[PDB]
Amino acid sequence: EKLRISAKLKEVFKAQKANVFTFKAKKPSNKTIYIVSDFNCPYCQREFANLDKRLESANVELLVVGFLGEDSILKAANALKNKSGNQAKDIAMLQKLYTPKSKGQSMDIKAAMALTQAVADTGVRSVPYIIEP
Q1: Engineering a disulfide at 62: which of 21, 72, 102, 118 sits with its beta carbon 3.0 to 4.6 angstroms away?
Q2: How many structural domains compose the chain?
């Protein structure tokens, strides 16, 4: 949304890379779209349904946060716990959580809360928040 916020947010992506999903583009490059996302937000769900198109010209770094309450933070904890680093396996796993009818499973939420709050600390207030190169 705003350059000063995105500048702060870019530093969180770097500092939090262990918790970031990195999707290599179909065409290798150094452009990188940074996406901050909530699994229960309809617009993030649409954005994720366009990941194939995003990855036609850029690398995508996906940072999931619980902005929409309890289920959202559970889904964020699920995703963070289940991140394999394998692109196809993680995309399939994310596809199941970006469904409106799916629910988050009970899990410790500490890492998801910290990641969420670290994104909130940059001034991000809405999702999807998107930085393009």
Answers
A1: 21
A2: 1
